[PDB]
Symmetry: C3
Subunit: 332 residues, 3 copies
Amino acid sequence: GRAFGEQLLKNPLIEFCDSVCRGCGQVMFQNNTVTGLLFFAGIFYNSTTLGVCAVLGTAASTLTAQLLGVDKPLVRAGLFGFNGTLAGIALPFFFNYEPAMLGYVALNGAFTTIIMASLLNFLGKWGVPALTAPFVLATWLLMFGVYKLSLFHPGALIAPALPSVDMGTVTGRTFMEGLFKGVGEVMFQDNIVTGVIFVVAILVNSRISALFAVIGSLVGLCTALIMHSPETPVRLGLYGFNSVLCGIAMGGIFFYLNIRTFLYALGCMVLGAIATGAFSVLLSPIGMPALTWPFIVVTWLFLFAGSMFRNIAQVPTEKAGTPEDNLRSLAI
Amino acid sequence: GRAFGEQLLKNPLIEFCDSVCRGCGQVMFQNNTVTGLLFFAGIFYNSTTLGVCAVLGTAASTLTAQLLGVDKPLVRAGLFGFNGTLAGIALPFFFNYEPAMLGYVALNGAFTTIIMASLLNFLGKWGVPALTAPFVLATWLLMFGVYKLSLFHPGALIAPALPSVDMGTVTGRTFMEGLFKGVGEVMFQDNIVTGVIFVVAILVNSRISALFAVIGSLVGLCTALIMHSPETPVRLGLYGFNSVLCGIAMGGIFFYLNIRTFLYALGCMVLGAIATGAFSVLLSPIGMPALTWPFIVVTWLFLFAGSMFRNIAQVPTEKAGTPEDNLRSLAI
Amino acid sequence: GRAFGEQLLKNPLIEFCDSVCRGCGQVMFQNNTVTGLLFFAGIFYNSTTLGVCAVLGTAASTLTAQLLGVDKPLVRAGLFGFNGTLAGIALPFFFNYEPAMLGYVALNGAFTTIIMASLLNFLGKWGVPALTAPFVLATWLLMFGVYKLSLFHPGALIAPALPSVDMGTVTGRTFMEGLFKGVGEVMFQDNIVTGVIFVVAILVNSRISALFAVIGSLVGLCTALIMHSPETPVRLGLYGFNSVLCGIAMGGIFFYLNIRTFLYALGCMVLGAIATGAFSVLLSPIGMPALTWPFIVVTWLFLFAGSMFRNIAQVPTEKAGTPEDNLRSLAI
Ligand SMILES: [Au+]
Ligand SMILES: [Au+]
Ligand SMILES: [Au+]
Ligand SMILES: [Au+]
Ligand SMILES: [Au+]
Ligand SMILES: [Au+]
Ligand SMILES: [Au+]
Ligand SMILES: [Au+]
Ligand SMILES: [Au+]
Ligand SMILES: [Au+]
Ligand SMILES: [Au+]
Ligand SMILES: [Au+]
Ligand SMILES: [Au+]
Ligand SMILES: [Au+]
Ligand SMILES: [Au+]
Ligand SMILES: [Au+]
Ligand SMILES: [Au+]
Ligand SMILES: [Au+]
Ligand SMILES: [Au+]
Ligand SMILES: [Au+]
Ligand SMILES: [Au+]
Ligand SMILES: [Au+]
Ligand SMILES: [Au+]
Ligand SMILES: [Au+]
Ligand SMILES: [Au+]
Ligand SMILES: [Au+]
Ligand SMILES: [Au+]
């Protein structure tokens, strides 16, 4: 809603950085520069090394899109940044440092941009978004081969084992830590304050999305408890973060918020937590993380199914903004 | 072909139950109330607990479709029941009882309805049916995570191991038991009589489909023997049931029955048995069943390939009825 | 460019054999009879048994296409041969001999033709080629089940293990052997001379494709070295062969060759080598080879992404010939 003359003040660098910050915001579907800026602040609050590498990943993917000539509106909306943000954080989260790390992060970010284009072309025929599939698929391709290609060394989170069947103790701590690390863990941030920062950041762009961030973390948490997860992963928000994404996407962004789409959102948040155990098990023989594949698979299923259900009012993806903006234009 | 005035006697409950029974019939592509009714009778004959849970699964998926507002013809044809029937049986077949079982069955049935809608939207662009993919994908998502989410405990069929290379003895028993449990095992019914009941049930709607049920079970059985499976899985019909589905689908339902489409059907039944060993191995490191993924993958490949082969006359999916009805309308 | 009267000399057998040889040529995207003939000569040079089985596989897939009535131009272009060529070689490469081998090769070749049709129907909606996906998917389905179906016995290359983290010594030999076996290994030919023969064969149809065959082998090799692969797989060309295919496909066939599409090709060749470690690890718990899945997945991603990138000029697939013919018709 800004004065059109402000366009005279633009230059490639500042346009690039605005694209980078919107890119970061889009990790949680928030097309907002200030939201991306506060996401970065939250990460930097936890780890300077992770923040630099988030920025580098978002920059590499955004630049690659511009180099290949993606349509300017797609780039300006940060749709070619968010997968690069995650691609940048995931690598130093899971693998030990080597000098090559920064080069591999740039590569991983560049690759997300290819796959983002692939999936917009593939999925666009049904009006379905790519979500974080570009980040997951690129990262898996760059991570899985580490046992055969030793440049990097995996961290202690990466331990191949056949799955098998202690339980810990649920406390108030499980809930307060689970809630906010569930949000933080969307960006691999094992930090309660970063998690609060993340909610505040979404709140700047959209209050409804901030609430669904909170709801999803909670529904993921207690679904995992009802399903008898040990407490440790729950407290750590490992069953919240896919459900956070599920909540934000289904909660008024890709569907017009009402009672019915709310209940539909809830089914998707519950199944996202259950799919988290499923995919963790699937990849355990090779020791690899499922990342946000749970959110992606379950949310894709609910998105594809939308147009078949008369009682569930989808938002056309090309139009889809904040939940509030969505309801404002429906009522016009 | 019923008197149009019979519509005055309808009420939501009886329409629902007719949808449930057609739903059960569609497990084997039979849109017939009496066929579904006799499928239920066959299951109840084997296990009252499995029959109640088949009914509950079909009911949960059907109701969920109606709640979300699926187009009435899709629901009335039982297309939103059959995956719910399987989702209901599979869970108590593979996992030990807990009070939560019935809730998890309802959830699994509700989820099949989402995925059914997803796949009708996705695959419909090529006129290709969803088959039992909704049941397999939902069930895998609810089953795989059991090692991490302990509410349920897996039965002794579920045992993670890396695959490796005794053989038993083929007898007349291998054949008579293999044949009818091959049919029974389409619905997880380790019972010869249930298997005979199932054939009779299909016979009510379509004789050609009843024959292809029998052929597929046999082709799966002897393919497995030619390929040197140990006898035990063969006798148990574990190499028949994907081939039963392959036979029924390819045998005059999705292709007009003639000599060429017959031979095409046979190739699909053989490869369905071979794909059964393939997918059993693929999932063995996590101890999980492939269910009807073998049938689904191989039958999808033959369905997608149909429109490229001039010598193989596909039935448009929107039209596709019994093999007999298919040939009757081709000749008009 | 041949005299139209030469058509009077045609008969089904000679048309079939021309289709078989073009089929073999298409293993490396070369629609050329002489190229296929010299590919066969290269294989026969290494192993008579592998050459007969390449021929039998190409013949089985081609005949099956003709039996099912594939559009004559598709068959005449060898598009229904190349996956059959690979399907024929892969089985005796990985599994020990049994009398049944030839029957299983014919079956595997017939199956590639189904999947080729499937994928032309599926992918054709985006103008994207099937590549060697028919060969990989058919072969996996026929190979994975070997632990459960003992007709064949796997060779010592097939050894299920959970992955885990010696290095050898890089020499001039690593490079000269790596380069040419990288080309040879596109067809499972552990032979330096066969590899040289293969380059010469491509050179007959297209010099640019021959260069990209060489470049891809090299980029795969040194990517693997930069990524700290042990030397043994590198010397053996196991990190070249997916990158060879990547290079040939991206190097002027599916994209008009220029500086930008060259750099795009390079990104695809690098990621093909990295995806080779990834997929080798993914299948290691079941002991199975990834074959050309690395090339297929990475090249599909770059192909699908092409139409989104204004700076990257795709060749419409229906038109796509040699790099030289591609530039000749662009300039008209
Ligand atoms: Au910025
Ligand atoms: Au800035
Ligand atoms: Au900025
Ligand atoms: Au900013
Ligand atoms: Au958005
Ligand atoms: Au960094
Ligand atoms: Au870093
Ligand atoms: Au709870
Ligand atoms: Au709760
Ligand atoms: Au009923
Ligand atoms: Au009833
Ligand atoms: Au009824
Ligand atoms: Au009934
Ligand atoms: Au039907
Ligand atoms: Au029950
Ligand atoms: Au039950
Ligand atoms: Au037999
Ligand atoms: Au037989
Ligand atoms: Au020939
Ligand atoms: Au010839
Ligand atoms: Au010839
Ligand atoms: Au020839
Ligand atoms: Au071609
Ligand atoms: Au041979
Ligand atoms: Au052979
Ligand atoms: Au190098
Ligand atoms: Au190099």
